[PDB]
Each structure stands twice: as structure tokens, then as C-alpha cells.
Design a protein around this nucleic acid. Sequence first.
DNA 1: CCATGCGCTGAC
DNA 2: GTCAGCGCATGG
Length: 206
Amino acid sequence: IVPANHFGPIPGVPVGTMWRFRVQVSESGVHRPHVAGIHGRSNDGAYSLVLAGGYEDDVDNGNYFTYTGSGGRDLSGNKRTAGQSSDQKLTNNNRALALNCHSPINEKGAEAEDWRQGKPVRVVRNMKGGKHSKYAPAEGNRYDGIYKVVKYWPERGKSGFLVWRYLLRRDDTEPEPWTREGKDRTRQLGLTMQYPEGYLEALANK
DNA sequence: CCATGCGCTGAC
DNA sequence: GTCAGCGCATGG
């Protein structure tokens, strides 16, 4: 298996692979955190991210998307998500993702000199993003391939609070799973939704 | 030890 | 559709 700080595609996991739950995506190594949208280390970079419609400032255009950093929220009361109530900061996961950009870390944001030389990020799209994106899968989670950070910057989001934004652009030879070519490949590879052991059983009875 | 957290399940 | 809160993994 690969280390937790592995950059790039996970061997044996082609674009198009699908998992019903986040813990399954974690177990595969594609996106380790089972909750966080970003998996990264503040002195290395981000290895992967998940688009799940969790942040109102995200803009999903398929091969291109504007991702929002995490944080800027009050999670007291043992919460995992909430609306924006404070300015986000270029720290922890947010800092890791900015490091993927082919440019020195910049507190005011930056643009890549040559975006193709930036560190790769494995991208997963979750069905919940389907509320505003036509690229989200109908069910579960789907690995969509490698993307790179073209630029990142801070600005006031819909809430009026400062949020960090990142422009990601796809850089993968495997076809996008939402195109005719991607669907054909998924079919040819016989990829199907992965469910936990005995999940469907208990699911039906519910 | 402690902060973070783009989930998930059940009760309206 | 809202919404309250819990275990756990990862990073530091």
C-alpha cells in the first residue's frame, strides 16, 4: 500500500471508481479523512479533496472548479458542520492545499508560474454536490482523477465572511466519468457502486 | 493531549 | 427539508 502522504493516483484505483460511504473512500486510500473535505499536511501539501456541496462558495464546472477552504465556522456543541461565522485562515488544511500551487506560499494568495508543475490532488465528488452541480454522481462517492491548483485567493464569500478559494484544473489522461467516453470506460472496466458488507441487506429492511 | 471536521442517522 | 450530536481518523 501507499503511505498516507502519497501524492497522485492510488495504484489499482481507476477514475470512475465508486463507493457508497466516505469511510470506504478512506479505506481505499483515495481520501483518508472520513469527514474533512481536505486531506493534507501543512508542510507538504494536499493529497486529496472532496466536493460534497458542503460550502456555499464552491463552484463546480467539471474540468475546472473553485474550491472553498474549510473552517470559519463555530462547531461548539460537538458539531461537524455549520454556516460561516468568522473569517477563514490560511492554516492547517487550507495551507496544505495552497502548497500544491506552483508558487511560494502567499498570505495574500498566489497564482502558479506553471500550473502543471504543481502537486497533484486526487478529487472525489459526492452525490450531495448534485444539488447545484451537474457533475456530481447520483449516488455515493466517485473518484474523478487528478487536478492541480492554478491559483488561490481570499475574498468575502456569500456570507460576507472571508473565505479562501482555490482554482483547480484537471490534469489526468483518464476520461472524466461524466462524459460519454468516461461512462464507456466505466462500463468496460465493469466498475459498480461499492457497498459495505451486508449493507444492502440491512438497508432494504429499513 | 487537543483541534479539526464537505459525515451520517434518526427525529420531526 | 431541518436539525441536533456522536465515534472516529488524522495532524500537530
